[PDB]
Amino acid sequence: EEPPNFQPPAKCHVVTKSRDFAEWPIMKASEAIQRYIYALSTTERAACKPGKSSESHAAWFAATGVSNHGYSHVQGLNLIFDHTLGRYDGVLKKVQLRNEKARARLESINASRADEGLPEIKAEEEEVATNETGHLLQPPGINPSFYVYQTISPQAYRPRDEIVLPPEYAGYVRDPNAPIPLGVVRNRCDIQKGCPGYIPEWQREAGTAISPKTGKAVTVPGLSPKKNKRMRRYWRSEKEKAQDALLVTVRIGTDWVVIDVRGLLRNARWRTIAPKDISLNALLDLFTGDPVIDVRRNIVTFTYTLDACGTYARKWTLKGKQTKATLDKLTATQTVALVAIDLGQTNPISAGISRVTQENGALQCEPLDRFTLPDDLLKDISAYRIAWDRNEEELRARSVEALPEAQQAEVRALDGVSKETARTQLCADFGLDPKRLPWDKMSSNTTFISEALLSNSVSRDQVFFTPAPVEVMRKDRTWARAYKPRLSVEAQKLKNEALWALKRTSPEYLKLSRRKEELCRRSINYVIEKTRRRTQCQIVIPVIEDLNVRFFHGSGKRLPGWDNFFTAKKENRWFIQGLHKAFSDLRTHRSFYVFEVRPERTSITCPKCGHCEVGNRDGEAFQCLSCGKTCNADLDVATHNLTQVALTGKTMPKR
RNA sequence: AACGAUUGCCCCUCACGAGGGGACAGCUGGUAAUGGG
Ligand SMILES: [Zn+2]
Secondary structure, X not given: OOOOOOOOEEEEEEEEEOOOHHHOHHHHHHHHHHHHHHOOOHHHHHHOOOOOOHHHHHHHHHHHOOOOOOOOOOOOXXXXXXXXHHHHHHHHHHHHHHXXXXXXXXXXXXXXXXXXXXXXXXXXXXXXXXXXXXXXOOOOOOOOXXXXXXXXXXXXXXXXXXXXXXXXXXXXXXXXXXXXXXXXXXXXXXXXXXXXXXOOHHHOXXXXXXXXXXXXXXXXXXXXXXXXXXXXXXXXXXXXXXXXXXXEEEEEOOEEEEEEOHHHHHHHHHOOOOOOOOEHHHHHHOEOOOOEEEOOOOEEEEEEOOOOOOOOOOOOOEEOOHHHHHHHHHOOOOOEEEEEEEEOOOOOEEXXXXXXXXXXXXXXXXXXXEEEOOHHHHHHHHHHHHHHHHHHHHHHHHHHHOOOHHHHHHHHHOOOOHHHHHHHHHHHHHOOOOOOOOOOOOOOOOOHHHHHHHHHOOOOOOOOOOOOOOOOOOOOHHHHHHOOOOOOHHHHHHHHHHHHHHHHHOHHHHHHHHHHHHHHHHHHHHHXXXXXXXXXXXXXXXXXXXXXXXXXXXXXXXXXXXXXXXXXXXXXXXXXXXXXXXXXXXXXXXXXXXXXXXXXXXOOOOOOOOOOOHHHEOOOEEOOOOOOOOOEHHHHHHHHHHHHHHHOOOOOOOO
């Protein structure tokens, strides 16, 4: 009833080509089509319909006049056409979503503002990239995708004098139907001194020893006592490397290209969906027959055939009252693990494992284990945080170094003199003497300035207002918030375009971005695997609080300095986003159930007593003021309550 | 539970002979504007 609709990708390399990809008929022809179509306007595309059949393809190439350089493949081409229309329509769909995101942000600030009391921005100018005629600025550039199709799908590299390999693959024989041998020897302590892959005596029998040269203390974990660890093989030379490869070809009109399949073997021995002995032809049939060659990267992305592998992917994360039905259904037969995860800044995630079982009309939430992530991964988190923060500051400083002349000075000192400029203009505008009123002692709840305003008694019109749900004069904090020297937003765009471009191209940023995603998958993977090895129940369904609307899950109190009203990017909300994103992707990659329950109330109540006074929480100690108790507010009470609001779809009642 | 998996990529360690750990949904968009019931 739940058919698979997801196929994981597998990436391999490419060894040698016939001739540089630009010369390729398929590619050069596709490049011409890309150029003709990405500078085509909108309205003709509406009329345009490239037909699936080949006679319609030829009718199409004739009615517009663009040529195909001898390549009319029935249903070979269709892929190129469909993806080209896909990218073209995306470059407006992706802008339309961008504008809608800005609109939602604008609405959110308006709700905050026209309630808090300050001026409400009528609107922000609509951003579109489509020109009136239909030409598309910022057009999608030429792409390296080279789709391959069933009638061309890769096949085991037999020897053909026309097919010529680089000199390193001098003698290559490989029985395509034979079982591919295992690379490393079974016992890795046998390799002798000379042969490659020789593990020196001091990496066995894990110990701690001092190197000869300077005696620096160096430990070693030893040979890994694990059963499912990829083995790394080492050859003496690059020609010895060559003869032990997995070469497959793709043949189209006497212009081939040979690609190396070791990646798919590794990707198949990972999931244990490949027996320990398996043949090359069986491996190639284990995957879908439509790779995508990336010509600007020399990387081939295979995908899995649905039947071999590929789980179900639930389209939507489940929130709210649906949880009731999910537990009623998933628990009707068997017991389900329920790990509750709670994100923060001191302790990146805190998880509490329970074991949901079932007696008619009840969900007993037996809890097993509160835990925190281990020490080594925290050390990795710290090194990543230091690294990426340093990169961001250097990146921003750089972007600043290059700008129009009229821009640098203001953005150099906009936030520098801001506190001095702000207080001086405020005093000058309302005449207040700074020294008679203490200035440094401004806190999150201080209201000294506003009472000083009423002492001056200039008027009552400007101050009282009626926050849309009692007419209350609000915090002077709001005035402080208003009087902040934000620069022109006509140039904010120019500033952010410089920032966008520099990061878009610089390698460092991509490296760090990939590391963040990889290191964040890991932080949620360890957690999920531990809950599985702890509950002994196959179905583990992590429940995670939404952050999109999180509005009270914050630190105890901001610094009472004047400097700290404007603490841009205060070391927050990069990781958290990543954790939530990694989970929301855990939803689809492995078909897991995920539960989103609104945080805001959750972290400040408890099961022992309903009472939920907002002052009960220091920020790291959850002291109840009825049932005197001491807990780590995050680790023990917050996760327990997330599970509690999970078992029932109703959020906890308030007073 | 399911019994060490041939390149690669990342991190960590190294007596450079390698060892340990990790991601595997990828293409490109995407952390950048004024959001403490
Ligand atoms: Zn209590």
